[PDB]
Amino acid sequence: TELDQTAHQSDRLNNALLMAIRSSANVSSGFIEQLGGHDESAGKRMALSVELNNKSQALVDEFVENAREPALRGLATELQATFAEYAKAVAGQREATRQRSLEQYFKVNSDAGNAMGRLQTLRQQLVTTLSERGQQIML
Amino acid sequence: TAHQSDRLNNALLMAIRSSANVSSGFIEQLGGHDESAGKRMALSVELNNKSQALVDEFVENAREPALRGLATELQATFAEYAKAVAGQREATRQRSLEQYFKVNSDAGNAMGRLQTLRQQLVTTLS
Ligand SMILES: O=C(O)c1ccccc1O
């Protein structure tokens, strides 16, 4: 049944990164809605961005708990540390939205992109490692 | 089955990055970063073309009747998302905040459905 446990680890990964990117999509589009005077819609996107990054970090933390094989743990905790960096930058984008400052938005939008670029590469290496472990069981 | 999951997961990650880039690009236009906004727009076009190609490969390789209806639903829902993101791009080229807001709800709801659709598709891929 360790076979179906590598699939749960892979789905936690894919869901975490998808929601992590959806959260940045919500703050940027919410920032635009705010500049158009759509305060209510912008507030809902801020809340959705909070909820998505919290859900993603919960999956990430569940991911590193169940990653016990050392061929997997080395990439797992770098994914957690990189994500905490990504989460703070998106949180910085949200406070710039509430403050209506393009200045603060550009200040941390480069941080979010850098951490997201490393998150996507870390997912690729982790997905390959999980797929390799699952295949190792069938042979 | 491994190629289908890679197509599905990469298609969705690239589709959401295509949207995040046009919103980023729109914000750069508001700040006077016209050259940097053009680079976000081009990357959004490319991510959309690549994710559309993966969705097409996925649907063609999803023949087992347990997946045929779910694959077609993914295709149509993905079409709704891409159309909205294309509307985000055209609202950006016309520098219209109101046109951006109109299509933003269509993109958010479609991607919320794609998130649940992808989960159901990979459990049927087991
Ligand atoms: O994924 C979302 O929730 C979303 C929201 C607004 C715009 C584009 C999007 O993908």
Side-chain angles (χ1 to χ4, degrees):
Chain A
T1 187
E2 222 206 320
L3 200 46
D4 232 324
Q5 206 261 359
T6 64
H8 285 172
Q9 279 289 74
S10 281
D11 230 60
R12 290 181 188 108
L13 245 184
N14 291 312
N15 276 312
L17 200 46
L18 177 54
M19 294 186 305
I21 310 179
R22 289 186 63 211
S23 165
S24 210
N26 268 284
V27 62
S28 56
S29 65
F31 189 91
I32 290 149
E33 293 179 348
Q34 217 192 209
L35 291 182
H38 305 274
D39 302 323
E40 306 92 324
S41 195
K44 276 158 175 189
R45 305 233 169 265
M46 297 302 107
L48 188 55
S49 167
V50 173
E51 177 189 359
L52 288 165
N53 253 7
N54 282 337
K55 277 178 163 166
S56 161
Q57 182 121 52
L59 291 173
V60 165
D61 297 354
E62 193 181 34
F63 177 90
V64 186
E65 306 314 322
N66 296 288
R68 93 294 274 160
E69 226 81 349
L72 192 46
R73 185 163 180 95
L75 302 155
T77 189
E78 193 184 344
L79 170 85
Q80 200 170 45
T82 297
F83 185 84
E85 176 180 25
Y86 171 77
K88 179 177 173 177
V90 179
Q93 286 176 135
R94 289 192 295 261
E95 213 49 49
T97 300
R98 303 184 182 99
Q99 283 183 110
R100 287 182 191 80
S101 151
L102 282 146
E103 295 66 42
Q104 324 203 353
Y105 190 86
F106 301 138
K107 172 66 184 301
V108 306
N109 189 270
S110 90
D111 293 358
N114 290 322
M116 180 45 67
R118 277 175 292 114
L119 277 179
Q120 287 183 89
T121 296
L122 273 158
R123 174 195 160 273
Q124 289 174 286
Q125 295 179 302
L126 283 157
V127 173
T128 302
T129 304
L130 287 159
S131 184
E132 177 190 350
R133 179 47 174 155
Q135 186 69 16
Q136 186 178 18
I137 294 159
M138 323 228 63
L139 295 63
Chain B
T1 325
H3 290 124
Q4 284 291 76
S5 323
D6 283 328
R7 290 179 187 115
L8 180 53
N9 287 324
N10 289 341
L12 291 204
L13 296 170
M14 287 192 303
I16 179 65
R17 291 173 52 215
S18 168
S19 188
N21 272 280
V22 64
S23 297
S24 267
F26 193 106
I27 298 174
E28 308 250 6
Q29 298 195 342
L30 303 165
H33 289 107
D34 304 315
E35 185 169 332
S36 320
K39 289 173 157 50
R40 303 281 218 171
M41 174 84 59
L43 182 54
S44 166
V45 171
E46 202 47 42
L47 291 164
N48 173 66
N49 294 343
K50 256 140 100 152
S51 51
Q52 187 62 75
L54 290 190
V55 170
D56 295 352
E57 283 176 42
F58 179 90
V59 174
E60 161 178 298
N61 286 282
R63 295 94 120 65
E64 148 117 347
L67 266 201
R68 213 166 45 154
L70 228 50
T72 301
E73 181 166 346
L74 160 75
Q75 182 184 57
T77 302
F78 190 88
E80 184 211 347
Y81 185 75
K83 175 170 123 252
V85 178
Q88 288 179 333
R89 276 196 294 276
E90 192 57 23
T92 299
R93 298 187 168 95
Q94 302 321 310
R95 314 220 162 197
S96 163
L97 289 155
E98 190 70 16
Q99 290 181 35
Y100 206 99
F101 166 72
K102 302 309 183 188
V103 302
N104 213 63
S105 57
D106 291 342
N109 292 324
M111 185 45 63
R113 178 52 185 148
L114 289 169
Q115 168 122 33
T116 58
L117 248 172
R118 181 204 76 81
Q119 187 67 71
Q120 303 183 8
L121 269 167
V122 296
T123 77
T124 319
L125 282 162
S126 289

